[PDB]
């Protein structure tokens, strides 16, 4: 089921499947179950109607999918358009966590640019 949108995890346990929802990890997923009244081993797919209904209803609290990936980029901009070292880093494809650039950074900049 859409649950939060598109994402339709099946077979996998409710917990490990719920995580598929863009914006939740082992924590948010493991809690949403009990909080809603669902086991862990329970297969989201095999689950009965209500056993999937509450999910959506409760996951509506925390932000997910779009909104997240959406506003998440806004926060990145807020500082970029600001002009602080942080933002400045992004508009330069350089690490903000204060790492070393002279070496190791392929994840930030990318593969060699010889």
């Amino acid at each position: 089921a859409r649950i939060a949108g598109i994402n339709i995890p099946d077979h996998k346990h409710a917990v490990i499947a719920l995580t598929s929802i863009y914006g939740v990890g082992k924590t948010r997923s493991k809690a949403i179950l009990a909080a809603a009244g669902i086991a862990e081993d329970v297969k989201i797919s095999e689950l009965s109607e209500g056993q999937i209904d509450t999910l959506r209803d409760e996951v509506a609290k925390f932000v997910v999918e779009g909104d997240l990936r959406r506003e998440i980029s806004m926060s990145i901009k807020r500082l970029m358009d600001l002009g602080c070292y942080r933002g400045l880093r992004h508009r330069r494809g350089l690490p903000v966590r204060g790492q070393r650039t002279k070496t190791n950074a392929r994840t930030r900049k990318g593969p060699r640019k010889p």
């Binding site: 859409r2 598109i6 959406r70």
Partner: protein, 178 residues
């Protein structure tokens, strides 16, 4: 004629006093929705067009009108034929009925909608805005659908000015943003 009736009834008179028109046979009416969904690309795939077709035929209650190429000298390329989309205007009944599935189940079936544009107007007074992305509304298997979509929509009212174009639509349930 669901919304249609509402027009003559609620609307019209509303404008007849807000615009003080002399004759009822003047009050701007709803002059067919147009739609389009310019498939563009096509060229290589071509299938994304037929898909866009049904994907369009789904929305509109009629049959998609696959267009061609006017210039045939597109900057990109494109030849004389080279299909690029499918307008598919609306017909009175289906038109207003569509004006229903829309504004009530289209814009409402948002994606992140928090207000509709108010400048989609024109000169003579005709609004036309592109959904930017097919809201996946009542389409063949909402989830089991074709890759994205996105299309345009033009109302083209019989108004003489965008100003008056505001009354219309707004006289209905046009989401807008104020």
């Amino acid at each position: 004629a669901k919304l249609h009736d509402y027009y003559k009834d609620e609307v019209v008179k509303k404008l007849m006093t807000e615009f003080n028109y002399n004759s009822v046979m003047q009050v701007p009416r709803v002059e067919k929705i147009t739609l389009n969904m310019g498939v563009g690309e096509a060229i290589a795939d071509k299938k994304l067009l037929d898909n866009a077709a049904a994907d369009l035929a789904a929305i509109s209650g009629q049959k998609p009108l696959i267009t061609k190429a006017r210039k045939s000298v597109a900057g990109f390329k494109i030849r004389q034929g080279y299909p690029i989309g499918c307008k598919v205007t609306l017909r009175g009944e289906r038109m207003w009925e569509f004006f229903e599935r829309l504004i009530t189940i289209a814009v409402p079936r948002i994606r992140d909608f928090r207000g509709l544009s108010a400048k989609s107007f024109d000169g003579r007074g005709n609004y036309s805005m592109g959904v930017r992305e097919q809201i996946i509304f009542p389409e063949i298997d909402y989830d089991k659908v074709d890759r994205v979509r996105g299309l345009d929509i033009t109302i083209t009212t019989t108004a003489k000015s965008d100003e008056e174009g505001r009354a219309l639509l707004a006289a209905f349930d046009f989401p807008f943003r104020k």
